Design a protein around this nucleic acid. Structure first.
Ligand code: MG
Ligand code: ZN
Lengths: 63, 21, 83, 226, 573, 692, 48, 237
RNA sequence: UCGGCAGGAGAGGUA
């Protein structure tokens, strides 16, 4: 309902969501922008966001 | 023209005018 | 390649920086985490004892940690794993 | 075959402001770059003198009118920009214009100091009816080029001084023409005819010699090796 | 690079300057440094030269119709109050220089700086993401300069004369340096055909095969060229290993060269090559003698006779109607059909009178700007105009703009000149709502994996055969078959395979398929992907902006909505 | 802005208002040039934005019925002979008559020369009827144009869009410190300045008795004496300067209706909005690429394009529930070094140079009864400067009308002089428009054979594709007028000069000519005049018969290989200056409900990062730049301060929090009786109020 | 209903490309397929 | 008047016969006053010597192919016009090249006329393969610049004296670019970056050392009309 | 240490 309420017809979608007691899982681009989180695309996905970097053994030993 | 003191600006017009603005 | 020397922000060339990584989305995180490690080393060396590693390559006069991180990546002195 | 005739200069005077100079025989090609080197050095870096501030008595800014003069202060200012002055001392010198009564204020009413000479004793500065007097104090200085107005409260001055723009170039127009000699038997050369027109402060042969000193002293950081 | 005013960079970089000012013992406290910065003391103009070193900024112009409306540059301090923009990014920004304005933004953290320096840099974004065509290309003045330089003029000064008896070749040169020294003396023209010994330029394919055969060690191997000086000075701008071109540089040829360089070389040599093409174009545009005067707009020689003939043909129809044969629409239709042939005879006389060294001709013949309809309107006749309803007026405008319209012709010229502007103003508010509607529906499509190992696909036409037995290439094949992944192997006459499953379709694969008697092919398309959420990289294919396979995590959904809607204000229907 | 804009404002017909239309309801059929507009509305002068076709201008000869219907005059013709009787006709009466065209050959007696003429039939149908049915005729070729469109020479050679832009941009010019009339004009400029009303004319005949810079005394013939005062350096509605200067001597004889004093944009009684500059049409190293313009430095060292702008600031002294505000120099909060330019009343002194953040007046507010005095002083805003030229103080105790609740008023006027610089907008009368790309030294500029540098360089790639060829004709005629010409008549008048008057067969250097809007100089006449021009001091003719000259290169010295077009053109300065458009901000004031940065340049606001700009960020893949742009730079109240401290101290930037607008939205949803809650991974709704 | 799901996607991706190709604008077919894919993702129940 | 900041020349040796001189800081506008005149003084003022005519044997008419050699006369001219020669004399001299036999005639075979020298004696002129003999008589004179062939009219003494072009200049390619620098708060300054490439008989540094001695004596004819003229002093070295 | 602020409507313009 958060992504549909910000597109068009706010009153109708809000009324239908209130009657149906809908739940939003916050798993889209628009909702993550609205609530202030990292979008699930590009550099915001799990594979790229959890990279661990450390110097190699030889360079650490040399310096 | 038609004004007491005005600079002399020569014109290329070939038609005459029967009315004033 | 047969290019002239790059100047400023286009050094090192990215066509060689992209040969050490899987895509252009992992290079950003690689560089941005090495820069933070370098900054932590700089701001903790003058106070107490820390656990990070300083610049593995010789810096300049006043160089940003991102440039040092990119130079370290280009010289094959680091290693990373993907989540 | 290599030539040996060294270039030689020669002047001819057509007036007291205009003159021509011939410089033969140059090498085939080297006839337009010497002309442009001298036109680009004659119209930029020649020192002179110009007025840099005025001080009327009764006025405070430049956006007002004096009583008895048919112009405001911005027209006296835009009419005091075509005054050809000269100087010999490296320090500001204060002139004085004090005229009153019916007439027309010209540039011959500025009593000069001793070392300053006005070269235009017939320009216009204002018109006076029988109800106004003009008391001006012009400050003359020396320099080079075009310097914009030196601000007031950024130089330690009072509240009556009106800064003015100063143009220090004593040269008006410069051109050249080349007469090429393209014969056979490969014996070619050139010939440059420079024309220098100065305002009235510097003779046409002292500007070419200040540009010849500037160019004999800028092309010397090249022959420092040999 | 860009250019940033000093008074704007001082305000944008205030805390970094305050930190640097405190560090260098130029102040005591943070408040003292703040006051000194706010008072513009002369001590703050030296730290604001290493503060802004290698710190990118973002430039934006509205409307932002696609990705290239935001780009990252490296600031430089200039004198003035205006921002300086590169000539080659105006196509991507869609920005002229008659009053436009742009906004500046400053990244702060390490991740934002890395993203700006890697993902958004201007020298990394050259190819358009909707069609794969180059955007940072020479245009306008550069095209004219590079078309003037590489043009061969027969019978010029110092050309090759194959004489005998009296004197030898007289016009063969031993090096480009000797040719330049000769052209500095007036003996030789830049656009005169000569023979010059080239050493550091790679020969064309056929010349290389004929002379060296195995390989041309071009660092020091000499051959012979029959070309002009301008073509040599143009080829000295391309990379070292690029074979000699020897052609006149129409805009299509330049686009082809740039596309080849982008597809066969790294992305840094292309950025280094466009910058020196722009230099040569700008240098030679000012020495080409393109200028406008009222004695270059030549009029047609025999125009009044054509017009009188096509006016008698109309007065017969008029007589007829006066007596009676047609109603009204037949009249108007035959008048339109006479005054639609008179403008074409005038056009074909104007396209035969004009010489080929005219400034008005070499601006439209080089591909820089303009059509020939405008040239016919300016120097021939305007033609038929339209009424407010939208139908042609049976009376034409017989006078060009070079002779001046009358009062009535000028008045009736505005009926269809106001409609253009009003509709342009009303077709910009119905395309942005379509774009907003397209973005929202396709906002959850993202590349999620690398391969779904599916077997479905779609069939692509890929040329058809004529009854005689000669294949006809499909007119629309760059936008339907190129940059796709095969689904099944391409076999022919129950024989071997030429290409294998899972290979991109470039031009070599396409020509190999076509030169073996294959028409129908099966590709992999996004319409038949097996991935639950989003799409996979293999089915989508190749990314148009970079030219390689797609990256896991890209937002293929927003680019599809920012591509179909970008060019919707040009749909004049 | 200038007299032309003021005159045009009073002649506007608007289709909107309380009883008309709306910018949204109006379609595409109410914004069209109807065939019945001929002589009543101008088809060219109209706005360019969303108000295209909804605002128009009255024509020069039009007049209004006693009912509200616009009329226009015609000449009655009988038996194929044009008479001289004028009748005014409305659009409902002229559709039953055949009306001829203004450009029609008429003999000495008044009979049509051409067998057939172009007429206008009932439903705006244009036809070619044999001239024996005509019933009316136009009065002049300029009957269908307005007062600003009738000031463009060679209008019939320009496209409609470019003439539209030229007419719109002629009303945006600024007055300059010195004015000069065009070398090539139209003749409408004399009666467009008297009727505008920015000049001073004499109401009776007499001799001039006394003339000064601010008054003129005229002695009438009967004995009465009348004196006229002048407005010296007055501020207009748009911050420009309105200055009047006398142009008469102390003994001249003056006739009724003669112009006595000049005005803002007036030169000897005729409107002058620009200056005459020497032009070259050629590309130059890419500095005039894509509508840019290259200027010379002689236009800055000689004040050719310089204007004066005046500003006004006010403050009010009122009473309070804790006392009464008073204006005084004594302020116990600020030092004595910055209170040296104030007088014994708390105001600045006339002639002082103020700057940004400087002090203008000194006012304090009591906080109740000492040490109750606070500081509230009027200061110069950010990025302003200039001298102080006037102060007007109003008080209550000296019997002056004042709003209730206030005690004293004071106004301060600040003036500056602005030169030309990079980013300023220039224009012509034909649609040329661009910003200044570079300003070059006079030695770096192309120069003619006698050493005369050019003043402006324009590109040749923009002329052919926009169909405004009137500018090239204007440059040709301007060069011919500047140099002066003389037609040889030893063997009789040449064939091309048969229709020229006898006073146009010879002209003096720096002559002024006039080419009316639809009846002017032909092209045979221009081509013949281009080969008759006089030489200069030395017997040389620089511009040949084609209007082209050979120029030298001021950076290398070699001549350019081909001749280039040279001439004179009329250039105006537009009121879009770069000094009023530059802005930047790091931190400043914030809003109240949603704690986002303020908007606008006067309030030190930020720039909007709209919806369309987020799609580009999401298509690039930049997930961290967007998050930082949306949280710690706009709404995160707790992260903004930590970010500033980290930047100043040199540490790492912290992690963004949660924006406040989301909480505002949640309380909005809860106020409509909606039970919206934020759950966790195991229920147990989060408080979302901080406080711990 | 007459032909099937596979032919509507060809009719759509062709009728959309004709409009853009008439005026000389080049867009790849892979950009319209992404949007057409989202138009056919639901099923209407006849009997439950 | 003083300049404020004294310019300084610096070099950057790239190869052995190519360098890159930089002159900065130059007052606004003096980067284009010093560029074109240094390029022209460098490419048309240094004297030198070169071959100006040849007289190959066996060519009474049609200059197409010479008996024995594997090259046309135009390739022989192109290979006998890139010879770096030098002469310490005044009037035209004469050289001879006479090699007979299967081999490869090279520049190390022209016997020097006691006074003129060949500095590149490793270049290939032709390959005498079909057992013949080559006899070339060259005329090496001195001059300056690039002089196109001086087509003569001896009408008898020139039985077959083919006239060739003469590249007398010891410099081969000069290019210059004017940049911009910053001195304090004032940008828009200048910086000249020349690029001289010479032959094998002069070094790239004696060129911009003997091209500042034919211009401190060409612009020295002006500073002699009035010795005291108040120019612009540059300051102590 | 006192002490200390930022909503709506209408009109005209630039790209
Ligand atoms: Mg624009
Ligand atoms: Zn798939």
């Amino acid at each position: 309902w958060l992504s549909a309420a910000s597109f068009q017809e706010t009153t109708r979608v809000l009324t239908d969501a209130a009657i149906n007691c809908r739940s939003d899982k916050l798993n889209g681009l628009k909702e993550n922008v609205i609530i202030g989180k990292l979008i699930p695309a590009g550099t915001g996905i799990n594979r790229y966001r959890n990279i661990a970097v450390q110097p190699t053994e030889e360079a650490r030993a040399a310096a | 023209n038609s004004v007491p003191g005005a600079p002399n600006r020569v014109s290329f017009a070939k038609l005459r005018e029967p009315l004033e603005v | 390649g047969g290019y002239d020397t790059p100047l400023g922000i286009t050094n090192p060339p990215i066509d060689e920086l992209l040969d050490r990584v899987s895509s252009k989305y992992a290079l950003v995180i690689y560089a941005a985490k090495r820069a933070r490690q370098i900054n932590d080393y700089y701001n903790q060396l003058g106070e107490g004892i820390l656990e990070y590693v300083g610049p593995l390559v010789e810096p300049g006069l006043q160089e940003k940690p991102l440039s040092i991180a990119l130079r370290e990546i280009h010289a094959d002195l680091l290693e990373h794993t993907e989540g | 075959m290599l030539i040996s005739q060294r270039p030689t200069l020669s002047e001819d005077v057509l007036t007291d402001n205009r003159s021509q100079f011939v410089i033969e025989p140059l090498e085939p090609g080297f006839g337009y770059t010497l002309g442009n080197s001298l036109r680009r050095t004659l119209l930029s870096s020649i020192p002179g003198a110009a007025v840099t501030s005025i001080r009327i008595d009764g006025v405070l800014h430049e956006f007002t009118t004096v009583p008895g003069v048919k112009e405001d202060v911005t027209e006296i200012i835009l009419n005091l920009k075509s005054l050809v002055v000269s100087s010999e001392e490296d320090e500001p010198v204060t002139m004085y214009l004090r005229k009153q009564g019916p007439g027309e204020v010209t540039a011959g009413d500025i009593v000069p100091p001793a070392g300053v000479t006005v070269h235009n004793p017939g320009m216009h500065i204002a018109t006076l009816n029988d109800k106004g007097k003009l008391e001006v104090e012009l400050v003359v200085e020396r320099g080079r080029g075009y310097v914009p107005a030196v601000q007031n409260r950024a130089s330690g001055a009072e509240i009556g001084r009106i800064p003015v723009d100063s143009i220090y170039s004593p040269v008006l127009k410069v051109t050249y023409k080349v007469d090429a000699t393209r014969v056979e038997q490969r014996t070619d050369f050139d010939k440059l005819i420079l024309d220098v027109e100065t305002k009235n402060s510097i003779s046409p042969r002292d500007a070419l010699a200040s540009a010849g000193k500037t160019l004999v002293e800028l092309f010397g950081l090249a022959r420092e090796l040999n | 690079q860009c250019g940033l005013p000093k008074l704007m960079a001082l305000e944008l970089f205030k805390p970094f300057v305050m930190k640097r000012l405190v560090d260098l013992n130029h102040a005591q406290n943070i408040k003292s440094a703040k006051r000194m910065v706010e008072r513009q003391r002369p001590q703050v103009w030296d730290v604001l030269e290493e503060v802004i070193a290698e710190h990118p900024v973002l430039l934006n112009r509205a409307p932002t119709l696609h990705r290239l409306g935001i780009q990252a540059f490296e600031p430089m301090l200039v004198e003035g109050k205006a921002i300086q923009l590169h000539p080659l990014v105006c196509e991507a920004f869609n920005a002229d220089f008659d009053g436009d304005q742009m906004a500046v933004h400053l990244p702060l953290s390490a991740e934002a700086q890395a993203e700006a320096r890697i993902l958004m840099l201007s020298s990394n974004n050259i190819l358009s993401p909707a069609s794969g065509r180059p955007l940072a290309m020479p245009r306008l003045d550069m095209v004219t300069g590079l078309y003037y330089l590489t043009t061969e003029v027969p019978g010029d000064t110092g050309e090759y004369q194959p004489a005998s008896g009296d004197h030898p070749e007289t016009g063969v040169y031993s090096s480009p340096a000797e040719a330049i020294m000769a052209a500095d003396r007036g003996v030789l023209s830049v656009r005169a055909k000569i023979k010059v010994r080239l050493t550091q330029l790679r020969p064309p394919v056929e010349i290389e095969a004929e002379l060296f055969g195995h390989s041309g060690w071009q660092p020091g191997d000499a051959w012979m060229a029959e070309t002009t000086l301008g073509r040599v000075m143009f080829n000295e701008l391309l990379p070292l290993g690029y074979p000699f071109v020897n052609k006149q540089m129409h805009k299509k040829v330049q686009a082809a060269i740039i596309n080849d360089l982008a597809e066969r070389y790294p992305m840094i040599v292309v950025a280094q090559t466009v910058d020196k093409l722009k230099d040569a174009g700008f240098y030679w545009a000012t020495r080409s003698g393109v200028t406008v005067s009222m004695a270059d707009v030549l009029v047609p020689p025999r125009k009044k006779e054509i017009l009188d003939h096509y006016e008698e043909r109309a007065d017969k129809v008029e007589k007829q109607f006066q007596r009676g044969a047609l109603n009204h629409d037949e009249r108007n239709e035959a008048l339109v059909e006479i005054w639609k042939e008179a403008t074409d005879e005038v056009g074909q006389a104007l396209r035969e009178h004009y010489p080929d060294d005219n400034p008005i001709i070499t601006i439209v013949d080089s591909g820089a700007t303009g059509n020939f309809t405008q040239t016919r309107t300016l120097a021939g006749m305007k033609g038929l105009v339209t009424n407010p309803k939208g139908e042609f007026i049976p009376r034409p405008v017989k006078s060009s703009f070079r002779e001046g319209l009358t009062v009535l012709e000028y008045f009736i010229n505005t009926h269809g000149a106001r409609k253009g502007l009003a509709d342009t103003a009303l077709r910009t508010a119905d395309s942005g709502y379509l774009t907003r509607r397209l973005v929202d529906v396709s906002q959850d499509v993202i590349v999620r994996e690398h391969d779904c190992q599916t077997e479905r696909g779609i069939v692509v036409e890929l040329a058809e055969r004529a009854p005689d037995g000669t294949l006809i290439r499909d007119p629309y094949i760059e936008t339907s078959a190129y940059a796709r992944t095969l689904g099944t192997d391409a076999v022919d006459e129950a024989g071997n395979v030429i290409v294998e499953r899972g290979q991109d379709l470039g031009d070599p694969e396409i020509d190999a398929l076509l030169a073996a008697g294959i028409t129908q092919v099966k590709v992999r398309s996004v319409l038949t992907c097996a991935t639950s959420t989003g799409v996979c990289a293999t089915c989508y294919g190749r990314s148009m902006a970079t030219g390689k396979l797609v990256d896991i995590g890209e937002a293929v959904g927003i680019v599809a909505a920012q591509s179909i809607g970008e060019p919707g204000t040009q749909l004049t229907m | 802005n200038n007299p032309l804009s003021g005159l045009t404002h009073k002649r506007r017909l608007s289709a909107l208002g309380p009883g008309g239309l709306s910018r949204e309801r109006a379609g595409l059929e109410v914004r069209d040039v109807h065939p019945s507009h001929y002589g009543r509305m101008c088809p060219i002068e109209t706005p360019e934005g969303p108000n295209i076709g909804l605002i128009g201008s009255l024509s020069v000869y039009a007049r209004v019925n006693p009912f509200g219907f616009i009329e226009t005059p015609y000449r009655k013709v009988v038996d194929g002979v044009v008479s001289d009787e004028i009748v005014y006709l409305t659009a409902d009466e002229e559709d039953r008559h055949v009306v001829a065209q203004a450009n029609s050959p008429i003999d000495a007696d008044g009979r049509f020369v051409e067998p057939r003429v172009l007429v206008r039939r009932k439903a705006g149908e244009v036809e070619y009827v044999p001239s024996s049915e005509v019933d009316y005729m136009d009065v002049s070729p300029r009957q269908m144009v307005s007062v600003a469109t009738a000031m463009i020479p060679f209008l019939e050679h320009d496209d409609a869009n470019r003439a539209l832009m030229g007419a719109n941009m002629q009303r945006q010019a600024v007055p300059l410190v010195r004015s000069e009339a065009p070398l090539v004009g139209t003749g409408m400029e004399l009666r467009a300045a008297i009727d505008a009303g920015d000049v001073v004319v004499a109401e009776e005949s007499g001799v001039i008795e006394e003339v000064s810079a601010d008054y003129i005394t005229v002695m009438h013939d009967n004995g009465t004496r009348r004196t006229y005062r002048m407005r010296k350096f007055a501020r207009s509605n748009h911050g420009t300067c309105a200055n009047q200067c006398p142009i008469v001597d102390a003994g001249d004889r003056v006739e009724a209706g003669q112009v006595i004093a000049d005005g803002p944009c007036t030169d000897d009684g005729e409107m002058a909005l620009g200056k005459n500059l020497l032009v070259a049409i050629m590309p130059w190293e890419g500095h005039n690429y894509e509508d840019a313009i290259i200027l010379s430095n002689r236009l800055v060292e000689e004040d050719v394009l310089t204007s004066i702008h005046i500003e006004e600031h006010e403050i009010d002294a009122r009473d309070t529930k804790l006392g009464a505000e008073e204006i005084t120099r004594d302020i116990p909060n600020i030092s004595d070094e910055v209170l040296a330019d104030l007088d014994e009343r708390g105001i600045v002194r006339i002639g002082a140079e103020v700057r940004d953040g400087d002090i203008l007046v000194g006012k304090v507010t009591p906080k109740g009864e000492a040490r109750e005095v606070r500081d509230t002083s009027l200061k110069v805003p950010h990025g302003e400067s200039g001298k102080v030229i006037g102060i007007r103080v109003f008080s209550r105790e000296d019997e002056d009308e004042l709003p209730a609740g206030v005690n004293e008023l004071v106004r301060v006027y600040v003036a500056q002089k602005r030169k030309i610089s990079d980013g300023d907008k220039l224009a012509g009368r034909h649609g040329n428009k661009g910003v200044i790309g570079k300003i070059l030294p006079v030695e770096d500029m192309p120069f003619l054979a006698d050493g005369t540098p050019v003043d402006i360089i324009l590109n040749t790639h923009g002329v052919p594709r926009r169909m405004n060829i009137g500018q090239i004709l204007e440059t040709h005629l301007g060069w011919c007028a500047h140099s002066g010409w003389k037609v040889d008549a030893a063997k009789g008048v040449p064939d091309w000069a048969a229709r020229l008057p006898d006073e146009l067969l010879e002209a003096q250097p720096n002559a002024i000519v006039s080419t009316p809007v639809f009846d002017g100089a032909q092209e045979a006449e221009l081509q013949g005049l281009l080969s008759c021009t006089l030489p200069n001091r030395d017997g040389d003719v620089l511009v040949d018969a084609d209007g082209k000259a050979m120029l030298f290169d001021g950076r290398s010295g070699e001549p350019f290989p081909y001749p280039v077009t040279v001439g004179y053109m009329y250039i105006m300065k537009l009121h879009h200056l770069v000094d009023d458009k530059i802005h930047a901000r790091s931190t400043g004031p914030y809003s109240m409900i949603t704690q986002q940065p303020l908007g606008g340049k006067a309030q030190f606001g930020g720039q909007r990062f709209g919806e369309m700009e987020c799609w580009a960020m999401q298509a690039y893949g930049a997930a961290y730049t967007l998050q930082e742009l949306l949280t710690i730079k706009s709404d995160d109240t707790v992260g903004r301060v930590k970010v500033y401290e980290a930047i100043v101290k040199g540490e790492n930037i912290p992690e963004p929090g949660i924006p406040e607008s989301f909480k505002v939205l949640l309380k909005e949803l809860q106020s409509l009786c909606l039970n919206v809650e934020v759950l966790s991974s195991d229920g147990a709704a989060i408080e979302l109020r901080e406080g711990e | 209903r007459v032909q099937g799901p596979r032919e509507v996607q060809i009719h759509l991706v062709r009728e959309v490309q004709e409009v853009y190709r008439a005026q000389g604008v080049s867009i790849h077919d892979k950009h319209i397929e992404v949007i057409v894919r989202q138009m056919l993702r639901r099923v209407t129940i006849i009997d439950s």
